[PDB]
Design a protein around this ligand. Structure first.
Ligand SMILES: CCC(CC)(c1ccc(CC[C@H](O)C(C)(C)C)c(C)c1)c1ccc(OC[C@@H](O)CCC(=O)O)c(C)c1
Length: 250
């Protein structure tokens, strides 16, 4: 059966598209405001050198912090998110932050060269930049695998916004209180997505592939958290971060 999108589901799609359009700048016009990228000699990707310099960390922390602000803005516009308690809203935002960042970064990701192209060459990010921020291959390899896999799905903007919203409003996050209300909000979103795929996505399993991407995001989140922990041990690392990054990850 291919039921039609209800007027409510059409309203949800319109709200989420409008939310993304208001919170995502496809021109990357604010990037010149961040602390500048620094790309030092590190041809070998030396762990000792990367930790001593953390050359790309001030820029990447400003980029992530900026992205988190946009995610907070987007989440506030998800139908039903404001009905949740502010304690639950915060638990959901903190727990999903890195996952939504990985999802939203897909829009600038390019399979042409496996980079995130954000305007000029200074804002063309690669694997080597994440290593320059003190991260290891245990995070980077699955991260690129994820970007390619997601890119290959060729999601409609409607599916992309629905996927980010479903990611945020997850009832299975540690510390949530009203899991039942969260699940009801997510089910409303999930039903919209499944109905949308069946009636709007032309052929040539997409919903199941999008659900697997959410499971892939949990693993990446766990790996990122382990790496953030190592990075936090580096003396004076907090100066290279932001108050928002320190709260979300620390
Ligand atoms: C450079 C790659 C990547 C990929 C997800 C990234 C960047 C940095 C890191 C280290 C993070 C560190 O562990 C800590 C927490 C700061 C300490 C990692 C692991 C991946 C990245 C690329 C582009 C990005 O955004 C482009 C657009 O979407 C931005 C506009 C908008 O979102 O609205 C963002 C957000 C991130």
């Amino acid at each position: 059966l291919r039921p039609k999108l209800s007027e409510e589901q059409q309203r949800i799609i319109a709200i989420l598209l409008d939310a993304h359009h208001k919170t995502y700048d496809p021109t990357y016009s604010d990037f010149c405001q961040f602390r500048p990228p620094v790309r030092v000699n590190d041809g070998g990707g030396s762990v000792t050198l990367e930790l001593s310099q953390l050359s790309m960390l001030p820029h990447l922390a400003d980029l992530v912090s900026y992205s988190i602000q946009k995610v907070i803005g987007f989440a506030k516009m998800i139908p039903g998110f404001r009905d949740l308690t502010s304690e639950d809203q915060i638990v959901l935002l903190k727990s999903s932050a890195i996952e939504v960042i990985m999802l939203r970064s897909n829009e600038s990701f390019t399979m042409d060269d496996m980079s995130w192209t954000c305007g000029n060459q200074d804002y063309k990010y690669r694997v080597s930049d994440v290593t320059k921020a003190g991260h290891s291959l245990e995070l980077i390899e699955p991260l690129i695998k994820f970007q390619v896999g997601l890119k290959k799905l060729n999601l409609h903007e409607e599916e992309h916004v629905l996927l980010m919203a479903i990611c945020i409003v997850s009832p299975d996050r540690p510390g949530v209180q009203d899991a039942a209300l969260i699940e009801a909000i997510q089910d409303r979103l999930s039903n919209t997505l499944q109905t949308y795929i069946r009636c709007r996505h032309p052929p040539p399993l997409l919903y199941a592939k999008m659900i697997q991407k959410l499971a892939d995001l949990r693993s990446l989140n766990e790996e990122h958290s382990k790496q953030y922990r190592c990075l936090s041990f580096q003396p004076e690392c907090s100066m290279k971060l932001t108050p928002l990054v320190l709260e979300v990850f620390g």
